Amino acid sequence: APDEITTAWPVNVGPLNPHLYTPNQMFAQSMVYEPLVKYQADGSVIPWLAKSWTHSEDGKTWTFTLRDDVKFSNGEPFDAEAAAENFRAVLDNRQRHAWLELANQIVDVKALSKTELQITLKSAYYPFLQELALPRPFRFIAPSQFKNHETMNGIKAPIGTGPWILQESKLNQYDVFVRNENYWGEKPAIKKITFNVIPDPTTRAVAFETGDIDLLYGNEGLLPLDTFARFSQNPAYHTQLSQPIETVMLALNTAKAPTNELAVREALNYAVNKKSLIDNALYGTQQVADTLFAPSVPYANLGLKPSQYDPQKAKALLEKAGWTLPAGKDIREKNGQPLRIELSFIGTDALSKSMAEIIQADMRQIGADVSLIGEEESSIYARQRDGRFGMIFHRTWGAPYDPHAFLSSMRVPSHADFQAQQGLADKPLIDKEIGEVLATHDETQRQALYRDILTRLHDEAVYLPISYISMMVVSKPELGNIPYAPIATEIPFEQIKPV
């Protein structure tokens, strides 16, 4: 069966609720639901569901001209009314979509013609279109699929206008998608796709080796990085390491002891040996990260000073900061307390645990005792809102979120970044400039803003950049080159031309 292919994923696709996050896997959501406008690599956008559009001279009111020849998955019709209903459906939950400034920007939406769609915003929002193209929450599910007239409280059956229809899902085993025969665009060469739920990376590797897996698409965690290196040397397989897409780092808690002290945060930076960590835990397959964003990220090439591995400098800062060594002890104490710091991570994540132990051992050489708290992913995401952490693995989102959406998110008190930045005297001002960066049409004002924000976050040592990671692919040679989607979180299955 060429028309058909099997792949893998650590967890099920989820309910495929277009307007909800966890556990709805993004790539999947992007398979079923579509946007009015679609994101391009050049950073621009092309018309999609919205055939073309028009805007008020004052740029606050927008009117899109939808496609008529577009039928929802279940034969139903896609029109301005369903659209308005989705937006409305989404906005009824605006509070949680607070991270995406477009959310708290939509004044209201209403249906003009059967195909005319009018959107008015509080302001002439320049990130309007690029933010509609996102995988969520402004995608569309048939109105005839709510739990009342609400999607925030669940949906009926995941039906959209995508080219892929979730034909079947079975907890802990697989998720099946079939080609949507009544799609409005080009016909996807693959007719069926099957995702095998396989948590372990080593298992995913063997799974591929049996011949039962056509492809493996994911990030640094896909399969063990050394096996991937053996795999790329194998004539019968095919592998690919994309260039960096986002950065992984630790987030230090400024609003909590002892990470409430700039000295301790700076010292934590000079104590970790990135390379040794990278070469040893990531198998030299990814690259070292000095700043929150790589210099190749628009607006981020700021010449920020990299903190180099320097145990020497490390313990010197720490002591001047009042954390001295007591007779007969390896760990530093201040006014009675030891320099203990807890590091939370997904206990069942082989990668996090490794960098964890390395970091732990690195810190111990400067008199700091870090405790590893490997926990359920649910408790981890919990401590991120709660702010119950000392240090915490965290990562950016790749294009097109980085850097504007990811910054926007820092303002919302419902996330790790906000939480970690809390105890910063700069915070109020930083959030002020993020809203301003999202608000100015002047490129030079924008350049300066990103500079001020990113320089503060950097100088105040909020994070401990570790590495810029890549997307990897392992596939059967018959599938040819596996393309990358402009949106970092999507998998371009429709482009895969088998044999």
Query: Which residues of this chain interact with ligand HCT, rule CB under 6 A?
Result: 21, 26, 99, 134-136, 397, 409
Residue with token string 């956008």? 45
Residue closer to ligand HCT (CB basis): 248 or 321: 248
Q: How far is the CB of 41 from ligand HCT (least distance, A)?
A: 19
Name the residue whose CB lies closest to ligand HCT.
Answer: 99
Residue closer to ligand HCT (CB basis): 270 or 468: 468
Q: How far is the CB of 380 from ligand HCT (least distance, A)?
A: 12
Residue closer to ligand HCT (CB basis): 412 or 437: 412
Q: How far is the CB of 384 from ligand HCT (least distance, A)?
A: 9
Q: How far is the CB of 210 from ligand HCT (least distance, A)?
A: 32
Q: How far is the CB of 430 from ligand HCT (least distance, A)?
A: 18
Bridge partner residues of 454 (DSSP): none
Q: How far is the CB of 98 from ligand HCT (least distance, A)?
A: 9
Residue closer to ligand HCT (CB basis): 62 or 418: 418
Residue closer to ligand HCT (CB basis): 249 or 370: 249
Residue closer to ligand HCT (CB basis): 397 or 493: 397
Phi, psi of 364, rounded to the nearest 5 degrees: -60, -20
Residue closer to ligand HCT (CB basis): 397 or 450: 397
Q: How far is the CB of 395 from ligand HCT (least distance, A)?
A: 9
**Burial group, residue 150, by CB count within 10 angstroms (0-12, 13-18, 19+):** middle
